[PDB]
Design a protein around this ligand. Structure first.
Ligand SMILES: CO[C@]1(C(=O)O)C[C@H](OC(C)=O)[C@@H](NC(C)=O)[C@H]([C@H](O)[C@H](O)CO)O1
Ligand SMILES: CO[C@]1(C(=O)O)C[C@H](OC(C)=O)[C@@H](NC(C)=O)[C@H]([C@H](O)[C@H](O)CO)O1
Ligand SMILES: CO[C@]1(C(=O)O)C[C@H](OC(C)=O)[C@@H](NC(C)=O)[C@H]([C@H](O)[C@H](O)CO)O1
Lengths: 189, 183, 181
Protein backbone atom coordinates (compact mmCIF):
# COMPACT_ATOMS: atom_id res chain seq x y z
CA UNK A 1 0.00 0.00 0.00
CA UNK A 2 1.85 3.05 -1.35
CA UNK A 3 -1.27 5.23 -1.58
CA UNK A 4 -1.61 8.90 -0.68
CA UNK A 5 -4.37 10.51 1.38
CA UNK A 6 -4.52 14.22 0.58
CA UNK A 7 -6.42 17.47 0.39
CA UNK A 8 -7.98 17.23 -3.08
CA UNK A 9 -7.05 19.50 -6.05
CA UNK A 10 -10.21 21.60 -5.64
CA UNK A 11 -8.94 25.21 -5.33
CA UNK A 12 -11.67 26.33 -2.90
CA UNK A 13 -10.97 27.23 0.73
CA UNK A 14 -11.26 23.94 2.59
CA UNK A 15 -10.49 24.65 6.25
CA UNK A 16 -11.58 26.67 9.28
CA UNK A 17 -9.09 28.61 11.38
CA UNK A 18 -11.53 31.17 12.81
CA UNK A 19 -14.63 30.73 10.62
CA UNK A 20 -15.74 28.32 7.91
CA UNK A 21 -13.87 28.53 4.58
CA UNK A 22 -11.30 31.03 5.80
CA UNK A 23 -8.24 28.97 4.88
CA UNK A 24 -6.70 26.49 2.43
CA UNK A 25 -4.84 23.56 3.97
CA UNK A 26 -2.48 21.50 1.81
CA UNK A 27 -1.77 18.08 3.32
CA UNK A 28 -0.47 14.90 1.70
CA UNK A 29 0.05 11.66 3.64
CA UNK A 30 1.87 8.84 1.83
CA UNK A 31 2.19 5.36 3.32
CA UNK A 32 5.73 3.93 3.44
CA UNK A 33 5.12 0.66 5.25
CA UNK A 34 4.92 1.42 8.96
CA UNK A 35 5.83 5.12 8.49
CA UNK A 36 3.78 7.91 6.91
CA UNK A 37 5.59 10.56 4.86
CA UNK A 38 3.82 13.90 5.06
CA UNK A 39 3.95 17.44 3.69
CA UNK A 40 1.78 20.31 4.97
CA UNK A 41 1.25 23.99 4.14
CA UNK A 42 -1.39 26.54 5.14
CA UNK A 43 -2.77 29.69 3.51
CA UNK A 44 -5.23 31.77 5.55
CA UNK A 45 -7.35 33.68 3.02
CA UNK A 46 -9.75 35.75 5.16
CA UNK A 47 -10.38 36.81 8.72
CA UNK A 48 -8.26 37.44 11.77
CA UNK A 49 -5.19 35.49 10.69
CA UNK A 50 -5.17 36.28 6.96
CA UNK A 51 -2.63 39.09 7.54
CA UNK A 52 -0.69 39.11 10.81
CA UNK A 53 1.47 41.50 12.82
CA UNK A 54 2.57 41.91 16.43
CA UNK A 55 -0.77 43.48 17.44
CA UNK A 56 -2.66 40.25 16.58
CA UNK A 57 -3.34 38.00 19.59
CA UNK A 58 -3.08 35.18 20.35
CA UNK A 59 -0.17 34.27 18.07
CA UNK A 60 -1.18 30.61 17.69
CA UNK A 61 -4.23 28.77 16.39
CA UNK A 62 -5.16 25.12 15.99
CA UNK A 63 -6.37 22.99 13.05
CA UNK A 64 -7.69 19.59 14.16
CA UNK A 65 -8.11 16.49 12.00
CA UNK A 66 -10.20 14.04 14.03
CA UNK A 67 -10.68 10.45 12.81
CA UNK A 68 -12.88 7.52 13.84
CA UNK A 69 -11.60 3.95 14.24
CA UNK A 70 -11.64 3.33 10.46
CA UNK A 71 -9.48 6.39 9.78
CA UNK A 72 -12.39 8.45 8.37
CA UNK A 73 -12.43 12.20 9.03
CA UNK A 74 -15.06 13.35 11.53
CA UNK A 75 -17.24 16.39 10.86
CA UNK A 76 -15.95 18.22 13.95
CA UNK A 77 -12.55 18.52 12.25
CA UNK A 78 -11.38 21.95 11.11
CA UNK A 79 -10.68 20.45 7.68
CA UNK A 80 -13.83 20.10 5.52
CA UNK A 81 -13.93 16.41 4.56
CA UNK A 82 -15.45 17.37 1.20
CA UNK A 83 -11.80 17.97 0.23
CA UNK A 84 -10.18 14.91 1.85
CA UNK A 85 -9.71 11.63 -0.04
CA UNK A 86 -7.24 9.17 -1.50
CA UNK A 87 -5.35 10.45 -4.51
CA UNK A 88 -6.19 8.27 -7.47
CA UNK A 89 -5.53 7.82 -11.17
CA UNK A 90 -9.19 6.83 -11.65
CA UNK A 91 -12.26 8.97 -10.86
CA UNK A 92 -12.86 8.68 -7.12
CA UNK A 93 -13.99 12.33 -7.06
CA UNK A 94 -17.42 11.26 -5.80
CA UNK A 95 -16.40 8.11 -3.89
CA UNK A 96 -15.27 8.70 -0.28
CA UNK A 97 -12.83 6.26 1.23
CA UNK A 98 -14.13 3.72 3.74
CA UNK A 99 -10.91 2.86 5.60
CA UNK A 100 -7.47 4.34 6.21
CA UNK A 101 -6.27 2.90 9.53
CA UNK A 102 -2.84 2.38 7.94
CA UNK A 103 -2.51 6.18 7.69
CA UNK A 104 -3.38 6.89 11.34
CA UNK A 105 -0.69 7.79 13.90
CA UNK A 106 0.11 4.81 16.11
CA UNK A 107 -1.64 4.85 19.48
CA UNK A 108 1.22 2.71 20.80
CA UNK A 109 3.88 5.20 19.71
CA UNK A 110 1.64 8.22 20.41
CA UNK A 111 -0.87 7.32 23.13
CA UNK A 112 -3.79 9.53 24.07
CA UNK A 113 -3.11 11.54 27.26
CA UNK A 114 -4.17 9.69 30.40
CA UNK A 115 5.50 6.92 40.04
CA UNK A 116 8.21 4.85 38.36
CA UNK A 117 10.62 7.17 36.49
CA UNK A 118 11.11 4.38 33.95
CA UNK A 119 7.34 4.62 33.29
CA UNK A 120 7.31 8.40 32.69
CA UNK A 121 5.24 9.22 29.60
CA UNK A 122 7.04 11.32 27.01
CA UNK A 123 5.42 14.71 26.40
CA UNK A 124 7.61 15.50 23.40
CA UNK A 125 7.31 12.29 21.40
CA UNK A 126 3.78 12.89 20.06
CA UNK A 127 4.78 16.33 18.73
CA UNK A 128 6.89 17.53 15.81
CA UNK A 129 7.92 21.19 16.10
CA UNK A 130 9.75 23.35 13.58
CA UNK A 131 10.01 26.79 12.08
CA UNK A 132 8.12 27.45 8.88
CA UNK A 133 8.58 30.66 6.89
CA UNK A 134 5.81 33.05 5.86
CA UNK A 135 5.78 33.58 2.12
CA UNK A 136 8.85 31.36 2.07
CA UNK A 137 10.96 34.37 3.13
CA UNK A 138 13.96 33.48 5.30
CA UNK A 139 13.36 36.60 7.42
CA UNK A 140 9.69 35.74 8.21
CA UNK A 141 9.82 32.75 10.59
CA UNK A 142 6.68 31.31 12.13
CA UNK A 143 6.18 27.89 13.69
CA UNK A 144 4.24 24.68 13.24
CA UNK A 145 3.44 22.10 15.91
CA UNK A 146 2.14 18.74 14.64
CA UNK A 147 0.48 16.66 17.39
CA UNK A 148 -0.53 12.98 17.24
CA UNK A 149 -3.57 11.57 19.08
CA UNK A 150 -3.73 14.38 21.64
CA UNK A 151 -7.42 15.19 20.98
CA UNK A 152 -10.53 13.67 22.54
CA UNK A 153 -13.20 15.68 20.68
CA UNK A 154 -16.06 13.84 18.94
CA UNK A 155 -14.94 10.60 20.64
CA UNK A 156 -12.17 10.43 18.05
CA UNK A 157 -10.01 7.31 17.79
CA UNK A 158 -7.07 9.18 16.22
CA UNK A 159 -6.11 12.78 15.63
CA UNK A 160 -3.59 14.92 13.79
CA UNK A 161 -3.45 18.51 15.05
CA UNK A 162 -1.53 21.39 13.45
CA UNK A 163 -0.84 24.40 15.67
CA UNK A 164 0.45 27.33 13.60
CA UNK A 165 1.80 30.57 15.04
CA UNK A 166 4.71 33.00 15.17
CA UNK A 167 6.93 34.77 17.69
CA UNK A 168 9.07 37.30 15.83
CA UNK A 169 7.89 40.90 16.15
CA UNK A 170 6.40 42.10 12.84
CA UNK A 171 5.51 45.74 12.22
CA UNK A 172 4.31 45.49 8.62
CA UNK A 173 1.43 43.02 8.19
CA UNK A 174 2.27 39.85 6.30
CA UNK A 175 -0.01 37.10 4.94
CA UNK A 176 -0.09 33.89 6.98
CA UNK A 177 0.99 31.74 4.05
CA UNK A 178 3.42 29.02 5.09
CA UNK A 179 6.33 27.29 3.43
CA UNK A 180 5.78 23.55 3.07
CA UNK A 181 6.87 21.34 5.97
CA UNK A 182 7.91 17.69 5.69
CA UNK A 183 7.52 15.23 8.55
CA UNK A 184 6.96 11.53 9.22
CA UNK A 185 5.35 9.43 11.93
CA UNK A 186 4.84 5.82 12.96
CA UNK A 187 1.64 4.40 11.49
CA UNK A 188 -1.03 2.46 13.37
CA UNK A 189 -0.61 -0.54 11.08
CA UNK B 1 7.94 2.68 -9.05
CA UNK B 2 10.25 3.06 -6.03
CA UNK B 3 13.27 4.16 -8.04
CA UNK B 4 15.86 6.81 -7.22
CA UNK B 5 16.96 9.66 -9.48
CA UNK B 6 20.23 11.15 -8.28
CA UNK B 7 23.59 12.85 -8.90
CA UNK B 8 25.30 9.57 -7.81
CA UNK B 9 26.19 9.57 -4.08
CA UNK B 10 29.85 10.69 -4.44
CA UNK B 11 29.81 13.09 -7.41
CA UNK B 12 32.74 14.84 -8.97
CA UNK B 13 32.27 18.63 -9.28
CA UNK B 14 28.94 18.87 -11.07
CA UNK B 15 27.30 22.19 -10.25
CA UNK B 16 27.67 25.93 -10.83
CA UNK B 17 27.42 28.33 -7.89
CA UNK B 18 29.62 31.06 -9.39
CA UNK B 19 31.42 29.30 -12.27
CA UNK B 20 30.85 25.94 -13.91
CA UNK B 21 31.63 22.88 -11.77
CA UNK B 22 32.81 24.94 -8.80
CA UNK B 23 30.78 22.77 -6.42
CA UNK B 24 29.54 19.25 -5.66
CA UNK B 25 25.75 18.92 -5.31
CA UNK B 26 24.68 15.57 -3.86
CA UNK B 27 20.94 15.15 -4.49
CA UNK B 28 18.84 11.98 -4.36
CA UNK B 29 15.12 11.84 -5.24
CA UNK B 30 13.29 8.66 -4.25
CA UNK B 31 9.76 8.03 -5.47
CA UNK B 32 7.30 6.98 -2.73
CA UNK B 33 4.15 6.73 -4.80
CA UNK B 34 2.95 10.26 -5.49
CA UNK B 35 5.36 11.91 -3.00
CA UNK B 36 9.11 12.30 -3.58
CA UNK B 37 11.52 11.84 -0.67
CA UNK B 38 14.69 13.90 -1.15
CA UNK B 39 18.07 14.47 0.48
CA UNK B 40 20.42 17.25 -0.59
CA UNK B 41 23.83 18.58 0.44
CA UNK B 42 26.26 21.03 -1.15
CA UNK B 43 30.05 21.34 -0.99
CA UNK B 44 31.47 24.37 -2.79
CA UNK B 45 34.96 23.32 -3.85
CA UNK B 46 36.40 26.43 -5.54
CA UNK B 47 35.78 30.08 -6.15
CA UNK B 48 34.02 32.84 -4.27
CA UNK B 49 31.84 30.58 -2.09
CA UNK B 50 34.30 27.78 -1.26
CA UNK B 51 35.47 29.60 1.91
CA UNK B 52 33.05 32.21 3.23
CA UNK B 53 33.28 34.98 5.79
CA UNK B 54 31.35 38.14 6.56
CA UNK B 55 33.22 40.02 3.82
CA UNK B 56 31.64 37.87 1.07
CA UNK B 57 28.58 39.33 -0.69
CA UNK B 58 25.93 38.56 -1.67
CA UNK B 59 25.22 35.98 1.04
CA UNK B 60 22.81 33.92 -1.08
CA UNK B 61 23.06 32.08 -4.40
CA UNK B 62 20.71 29.99 -6.54
CA UNK B 63 21.11 26.53 -8.09
CA UNK B 64 18.41 25.85 -10.70
CA UNK B 65 17.38 22.41 -11.94
CA UNK B 66 15.26 22.97 -15.05
CA UNK B 67 13.27 20.16 -16.68
CA UNK B 68 11.37 19.74 -19.94
CA UNK B 69 7.95 18.08 -20.12
CA UNK B 70 9.49 14.58 -19.97
CA UNK B 71 11.32 15.40 -16.73
CA UNK B 72 14.70 15.58 -18.51
CA UNK B 73 17.23 18.07 -17.16
CA UNK B 74 17.87 21.02 -19.48
CA UNK B 75 21.43 22.16 -20.19
CA UNK B 76 20.68 25.66 -18.88
CA UNK B 77 20.52 24.14 -15.36
CA UNK B 78 23.22 24.94 -12.81
CA UNK B 79 23.54 21.19 -12.26
CA UNK B 80 25.53 19.31 -14.88
CA UNK B 81 23.40 16.55 -16.37
CA UNK B 82 26.19 14.12 -17.26
CA UNK B 83 25.71 11.87 -14.21
CA UNK B 84 22.13 12.86 -13.31
CA UNK B 85 20.28 9.58 -13.86
CA UNK B 86 18.45 6.70 -12.23
CA UNK B 87 20.25 4.49 -9.75
CA UNK B 88 20.97 1.25 -11.60
CA UNK B 89 25.48 5.67 -18.73
CA UNK B 90 22.57 5.93 -21.16
CA UNK B 91 20.57 9.09 -20.28
CA UNK B 92 17.02 8.51 -19.12
CA UNK B 93 14.15 9.41 -21.43
CA UNK B 94 11.39 10.12 -18.88
CA UNK B 95 11.06 11.10 -15.22
CA UNK B 96 7.67 12.83 -15.02
CA UNK B 97 6.89 10.80 -11.89
CA UNK B 98 9.75 12.66 -10.13
CA UNK B 99 8.68 16.19 -11.13
CA UNK B 100 6.96 18.52 -8.63
CA UNK B 101 3.24 18.68 -9.37
CA UNK B 102 2.18 21.73 -11.34
CA UNK B 103 -1.26 21.44 -9.72
CA UNK B 104 0.11 21.49 -6.17
CA UNK B 105 2.91 23.92 -7.14
CA UNK B 106 1.79 26.01 -10.13
CA UNK B 107 4.07 28.44 -11.91
CA UNK B 108 3.69 32.07 -10.71
CA UNK B 109 -9.87 40.32 -6.09
CA UNK B 110 -11.83 37.42 -4.57
CA UNK B 111 -9.99 36.46 -1.36
CA UNK B 112 -11.18 32.89 -1.87
CA UNK B 113 -9.19 32.90 -5.14
CA UNK B 114 -5.91 33.89 -3.47
CA UNK B 115 -2.95 31.68 -4.41
CA UNK B 116 -0.39 30.44 -1.90
CA UNK B 117 3.09 31.89 -2.38
CA UNK B 118 4.57 29.90 0.50
CA UNK B 119 3.55 26.38 -0.42
CA UNK B 120 5.99 25.98 -3.34
CA UNK B 121 8.94 26.72 -1.02
CA UNK B 122 10.61 24.75 1.76
CA UNK B 123 12.80 26.88 4.03
CA UNK B 124 15.11 25.63 6.77
CA UNK B 125 18.43 26.07 8.49
CA UNK B 126 21.35 23.95 7.41
CA UNK B 127 24.64 23.90 9.28
CA UNK B 128 28.06 24.36 7.74
CA UNK B 129 30.39 21.47 8.54
CA UNK B 130 27.48 20.10 10.52
CA UNK B 131 28.41 22.39 13.45
CA UNK B 132 25.50 23.66 15.56
CA UNK B 133 27.12 27.11 15.82
CA UNK B 134 27.48 27.55 12.01
CA UNK B 135 23.92 27.98 10.68
CA UNK B 136 23.19 28.82 7.08
CA UNK B 137 19.89 28.36 5.23
CA UNK B 138 18.37 26.49 2.30
CA UNK B 139 15.30 27.39 0.26
CA UNK B 140 13.89 24.67 -2.02
CA UNK B 141 11.46 26.06 -4.62
CA UNK B 142 9.15 24.05 -6.88
CA UNK B 143 8.26 25.18 -10.42
CA UNK B 144 9.12 28.82 -9.86
CA UNK B 145 11.51 29.09 -12.83
CA UNK B 146 10.65 29.98 -16.43
CA UNK B 147 14.13 29.95 -18.01
CA UNK B 148 14.73 27.74 -21.06
CA UNK B 149 10.94 27.24 -21.43
CA UNK B 150 11.09 24.69 -18.64
CA UNK B 151 8.00 22.66 -17.79
CA UNK B 152 9.20 21.88 -14.23
CA UNK B 153 11.90 23.20 -11.95
CA UNK B 154 13.55 22.59 -8.60
CA UNK B 155 15.60 25.51 -7.27
CA UNK B 156 17.96 25.43 -4.28
CA UNK B 157 18.85 28.78 -2.74
CA UNK B 158 21.69 28.53 -0.22
CA UNK B 159 22.96 31.30 1.99
CA UNK B 160 23.79 32.47 5.48
CA UNK B 161 23.08 35.36 7.82
CA UNK B 162 25.30 34.82 10.86
CA UNK B 163 28.53 36.83 11.08
CA UNK B 164 31.61 34.64 10.47
CA UNK B 165 34.88 36.49 11.06
CA UNK B 166 36.96 33.31 11.06
CA UNK B 167 36.32 31.92 7.56
CA UNK B 168 34.65 28.54 7.11
CA UNK B 169 33.93 26.29 4.13
CA UNK B 170 30.46 26.40 2.59
CA UNK B 171 29.91 22.70 3.21
CA UNK B 172 26.34 21.94 4.20
CA UNK B 173 24.80 19.36 6.45
CA UNK B 174 22.37 17.09 4.63
CA UNK B 175 18.76 18.27 4.36
CA UNK B 176 15.71 16.01 4.01
CA UNK B 177 12.51 17.18 2.32
CA UNK B 178 9.50 15.86 0.37
CA UNK B 179 7.07 17.16 -2.23
CA UNK B 180 3.93 16.20 -4.12
CA UNK B 181 4.76 14.48 -7.40
CA UNK B 182 3.27 15.34 -10.78
CA UNK B 183 2.07 11.75 -11.28
CA UNK C 1 9.60 -1.47 2.52
CA UNK C 2 10.31 -3.04 5.92
CA UNK C 3 10.90 -1.20 9.20
CA UNK C 4 13.77 -1.67 11.65
CA UNK C 5 12.98 -0.12 15.03
CA UNK C 6 13.31 0.03 18.83
CA UNK C 7 9.60 -0.94 19.03
CA UNK C 8 7.28 2.11 19.29
CA UNK C 9 6.84 2.13 23.10
CA UNK C 10 10.19 0.90 24.40
CA UNK C 11 11.20 0.43 28.00
CA UNK C 12 14.45 2.18 29.05
CA UNK C 13 16.85 0.97 26.38
CA UNK C 14 19.65 3.51 26.02
CA UNK C 15 22.66 4.92 27.85
CA UNK C 16 23.14 8.68 28.05
CA UNK C 17 25.11 8.68 31.32
CA UNK C 18 24.48 5.16 32.69
CA UNK C 19 22.91 2.02 31.25
CA UNK C 20 19.18 2.23 30.48
CA UNK C 21 18.82 5.78 31.80
CA UNK C 22 16.78 6.81 28.75
CA UNK C 23 14.17 5.71 26.21
CA UNK C 24 15.23 6.10 22.57
CA UNK C 25 12.40 5.60 20.07
CA UNK C 26 13.85 5.10 16.58
CA UNK C 27 12.20 3.68 13.44
CA UNK C 28 14.04 3.18 10.14
CA UNK C 29 11.91 2.43 7.08
CA UNK C 30 13.48 1.44 3.76
CA UNK C 31 12.22 3.39 0.73
CA UNK C 32 14.46 1.86 -1.91
CA UNK C 33 17.75 3.73 -1.96
CA UNK C 34 16.79 6.02 0.94
CA UNK C 35 15.97 5.29 4.57
CA UNK C 36 13.16 7.33 6.16
CA UNK C 37 13.65 7.78 9.91
CA UNK C 38 11.88 9.19 12.96
CA UNK C 39 13.65 9.59 16.31
CA UNK C 40 12.78 10.89 19.76
CA UNK C 41 14.50 10.67 23.15
CA UNK C 42 13.22 10.74 26.72
CA UNK C 43 15.92 10.76 29.41
CA UNK C 44 14.28 9.20 32.47
CA UNK C 45 16.99 9.21 35.17
CA UNK C 46 20.38 10.68 35.98
CA UNK C 47 22.26 13.85 35.13
CA UNK C 48 20.37 14.65 31.91
CA UNK C 49 16.83 13.69 32.98
CA UNK C 50 16.02 17.27 34.12
CA UNK C 51 18.31 19.86 32.58
CA UNK C 52 19.02 23.52 33.31
CA UNK C 53 21.66 26.14 32.63
CA UNK C 54 23.94 24.70 35.38
CA UNK C 55 24.29 21.32 33.64
CA UNK C 56 27.52 20.88 31.66
CA UNK C 57 28.31 19.78 29.05
CA UNK C 58 25.12 20.71 27.20
CA UNK C 59 25.54 17.88 24.69
CA UNK C 60 25.83 14.07 24.86
CA UNK C 61 26.26 11.27 22.28
CA UNK C 62 24.24 8.12 21.57
CA UNK C 63 26.16 5.74 19.30
CA UNK C 64 24.60 2.96 17.20
CA UNK C 65 27.49 0.78 16.00
CA UNK C 66 26.94 -1.89 13.33
CA UNK C 67 29.05 -4.70 11.91
CA UNK C 68 29.34 -5.50 8.19
CA UNK C 69 26.00 -7.35 8.29
CA UNK C 70 24.22 -4.33 9.79
CA UNK C 71 23.84 -6.02 13.19
CA UNK C 72 24.04 -3.77 16.25
CA UNK C 73 27.17 -4.18 18.35
CA UNK C 74 27.01 -4.44 22.14
CA UNK C 75 29.30 -1.41 22.54
CA UNK C 76 26.42 0.76 21.25
CA UNK C 77 24.64 3.12 23.65
CA UNK C 78 21.39 1.50 22.49
CA UNK C 79 20.65 -1.93 23.94
CA UNK C 80 19.92 -4.43 21.19
CA UNK C 81 17.40 -6.64 23.00
CA UNK C 82 14.40 -5.01 21.27
CA UNK C 83 16.17 -3.59 18.19
CA UNK C 84 14.67 -5.65 15.36
CA UNK C 85 12.36 -5.73 12.34
CA UNK C 86 8.71 -4.84 12.95
CA UNK C 87 6.13 -7.63 13.12
CA UNK C 88 14.46 -13.97 16.67
CA UNK C 89 17.27 -11.41 16.29
CA UNK C 90 17.78 -10.36 12.70
CA UNK C 91 20.76 -11.68 10.75
CA UNK C 92 21.25 -8.92 8.16
CA UNK C 93 20.19 -5.31 7.57
CA UNK C 94 22.84 -3.92 5.22
CA UNK C 95 19.99 -2.31 3.27
CA UNK C 96 19.33 -0.08 6.32
CA UNK C 97 22.92 1.05 6.80
CA UNK C 98 24.04 4.52 5.70
CA UNK C 99 26.05 4.33 2.49
CA UNK C 100 29.82 4.32 2.88
CA UNK C 101 29.96 5.90 -0.59
CA UNK C 102 27.69 8.83 0.30
CA UNK C 103 29.05 9.03 3.88
CA UNK C 104 32.58 7.59 3.98
CA UNK C 105 34.37 6.85 7.23
CA UNK C 106 36.81 9.64 8.17
CA UNK C 107 40.25 9.26 6.60
CA UNK C 108 43.43 19.05 -4.85
CA UNK C 109 40.28 21.06 -4.09
CA UNK C 110 38.17 18.94 -6.46
CA UNK C 111 39.02 16.04 -4.09
CA UNK C 112 38.17 17.71 -0.78
CA UNK C 113 36.01 15.51 1.44
CA UNK C 114 32.79 17.05 2.71
CA UNK C 115 32.59 17.42 6.49
CA UNK C 116 28.92 18.39 6.43
CA UNK C 117 27.16 15.86 4.23
CA UNK C 118 27.41 13.00 6.73
CA UNK C 119 25.59 15.13 9.33
CA UNK C 120 21.97 16.26 9.69
CA UNK C 121 21.46 19.12 12.17
CA UNK C 122 18.22 20.68 13.37
CA UNK C 123 16.35 22.00 16.37
CA UNK C 124 14.12 19.74 18.39
CA UNK C 125 11.87 21.09 21.16
CA UNK C 126 11.73 19.80 24.73
CA UNK C 127 8.25 18.69 25.74
CA UNK C 128 7.33 19.86 22.26
CA UNK C 129 7.17 23.45 23.52
CA UNK C 130 8.10 26.11 20.95
CA UNK C 131 9.95 28.11 23.63
CA UNK C 132 12.19 25.15 24.66
CA UNK C 133 14.55 24.55 21.69
CA UNK C 134 17.36 22.04 21.86
CA UNK C 135 19.27 20.45 19.00
CA UNK C 136 19.93 17.09 17.42
CA UNK C 137 22.91 16.12 15.27
CA UNK C 138 22.62 12.86 13.32
CA UNK C 139 25.99 11.54 12.07
CA UNK C 140 26.56 8.72 9.57
CA UNK C 141 29.58 6.39 9.67
CA UNK C 142 31.75 8.73 11.75
CA UNK C 143 32.55 6.22 14.53
CA UNK C 144 35.49 3.82 14.72
CA UNK C 145 34.59 2.09 18.02
CA UNK C 146 34.36 -1.71 18.18
CA UNK C 147 35.76 -1.88 14.61
CA UNK C 148 32.27 -1.03 13.39
CA UNK C 149 31.52 -1.15 9.67
CA UNK C 150 28.65 1.39 9.88
CA UNK C 151 27.38 3.83 12.49
CA UNK C 152 24.53 6.21 13.27
CA UNK C 153 25.24 8.69 16.06
CA UNK C 154 22.75 11.02 17.72
CA UNK C 155 24.18 14.03 19.54
CA UNK C 156 21.51 15.76 21.61
CA UNK C 157 21.97 19.06 23.37
CA UNK C 158 20.74 22.59 23.91
CA UNK C 159 22.06 26.13 24.06
CA UNK C 160 19.22 28.32 25.35
CA UNK C 161 19.41 29.37 29.02
CA UNK C 162 16.87 27.45 31.15
CA UNK C 163 16.93 28.74 34.74
CA UNK C 164 13.87 26.63 35.60
CA UNK C 165 14.77 22.94 35.14
CA UNK C 166 12.93 20.99 32.42
CA UNK C 167 12.95 17.34 31.30
CA UNK C 168 15.14 16.38 28.37
CA UNK C 169 12.18 15.02 26.42
CA UNK C 170 12.46 15.69 22.69
CA UNK C 171 9.88 16.32 20.02
CA UNK C 172 10.04 13.74 17.23
CA UNK C 173 12.50 14.40 14.41
CA UNK C 174 12.27 13.12 10.83
CA UNK C 175 15.26 12.60 8.56
CA UNK C 176 16.42 10.48 5.66
CA UNK C 177 19.70 9.21 4.28
CA UNK C 178 21.13 7.27 1.34
CA UNK C 179 21.17 3.52 1.99
CA UNK C 180 24.22 1.31 1.48
CA UNK C 181 22.22 -0.95 -0.85
C1 LIG D 1 17.98 37.82 11.81
O1 LIG D 1 17.64 36.49 12.21
C2 LIG D 1 16.97 35.72 11.22
C3 LIG D 1 15.72 36.50 10.81
O2 LIG D 1 15.68 37.11 9.76
O3 LIG D 1 14.77 36.53 11.56
C4 LIG D 1 16.64 34.39 11.87
C5 LIG D 1 16.12 33.37 10.87
O4 LIG D 1 16.13 32.05 11.46
C6 LIG D 1 15.13 31.69 12.27
C7 LIG D 1 15.35 30.32 12.80
O5 LIG D 1 14.20 32.40 12.51
C8 LIG D 1 17.04 33.30 9.65
N1 LIG D 1 16.42 32.41 8.67
C9 LIG D 1 16.96 31.27 8.25
C10 LIG D 1 16.12 30.44 7.32
O6 LIG D 1 18.09 30.92 8.58
C11 LIG D 1 17.28 34.69 9.07
C12 LIG D 1 18.31 34.67 7.95
O7 LIG D 1 19.52 34.05 8.39
C13 LIG D 1 18.63 36.09 7.49
O8 LIG D 1 17.42 36.81 7.31
C14 LIG D 1 19.45 36.13 6.22
O9 LIG D 1 19.89 37.46 5.95
O10 LIG D 1 17.84 35.53 10.10
C1 LIG E 1 24.04 31.29 19.75
O1 LIG E 1 22.98 31.00 18.84
C2 LIG E 1 23.11 29.79 18.11
C3 LIG E 1 24.42 29.96 17.33
O2 LIG E 1 25.44 29.35 17.64
O3 LIG E 1 24.44 30.76 16.42
C4 LIG E 1 21.88 29.65 17.23
C5 LIG E 1 21.77 28.27 16.59
O4 LIG E 1 20.44 28.09 16.06
C6 LIG E 1 20.16 28.61 14.86
C7 LIG E 1 18.74 28.34 14.48
O5 LIG E 1 20.96 29.20 14.20
C8 LIG E 1 21.99 27.16 17.61
N1 LIG E 1 22.04 25.90 16.88
C9 LIG E 1 21.15 24.92 17.02
C10 LIG E 1 21.34 23.72 16.14
O6 LIG E 1 20.22 25.00 17.82
C11 LIG E 1 23.27 27.40 18.41
C12 LIG E 1 23.41 26.40 19.55
O7 LIG E 1 22.26 26.44 20.39
C13 LIG E 1 24.63 26.71 20.40
O8 LIG E 1 25.75 27.01 19.57
C14 LIG E 1 24.97 25.60 21.36
O9 LIG E 1 25.95 26.02 22.30
O10 LIG E 1 23.19 28.70 19.04
C1 LIG F 1 12.27 33.80 21.41
O1 LIG F 1 12.97 32.92 20.54
C2 LIG F 1 12.38 31.64 20.39
C3 LIG F 1 12.43 30.97 21.78
O2 LIG F 1 11.42 30.91 22.46
O3 LIG F 1 13.48 30.54 22.20
C4 LIG F 1 13.17 30.91 19.32
C5 LIG F 1 12.49 29.63 18.86
O4 LIG F 1 13.10 29.18 17.63
C6 LIG F 1 14.27 28.50 17.71
C7 LIG F 1 14.82 28.21 16.36
O5 LIG F 1 14.76 28.18 18.76
C8 LIG F 1 11.01 29.85 18.57
N1 LIG F 1 10.37 28.56 18.34
C9 LIG F 1 9.89 28.18 17.16
C10 LIG F 1 9.47 26.75 17.04
O6 LIG F 1 9.83 28.96 16.21
C11 LIG F 1 10.32 30.58 19.73
C12 LIG F 1 8.89 30.94 19.39
O7 LIG F 1 8.82 31.66 18.16
C13 LIG F 1 8.27 31.79 20.50
O8 LIG F 1 8.57 31.21 21.77
C14 LIG F 1 6.78 31.97 20.34
O9 LIG F 1 6.26 32.87 21.31
O10 LIG F 1 11.01 31.82 19.98
Amino acid sequence: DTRTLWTTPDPSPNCKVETARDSKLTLALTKCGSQILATVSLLVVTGKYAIISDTVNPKQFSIKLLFNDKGVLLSDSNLDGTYWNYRSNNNNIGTPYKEAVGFMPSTTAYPKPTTDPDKKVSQGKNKIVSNIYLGGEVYQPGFIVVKFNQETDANCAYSITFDFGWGKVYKDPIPYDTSSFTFSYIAQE
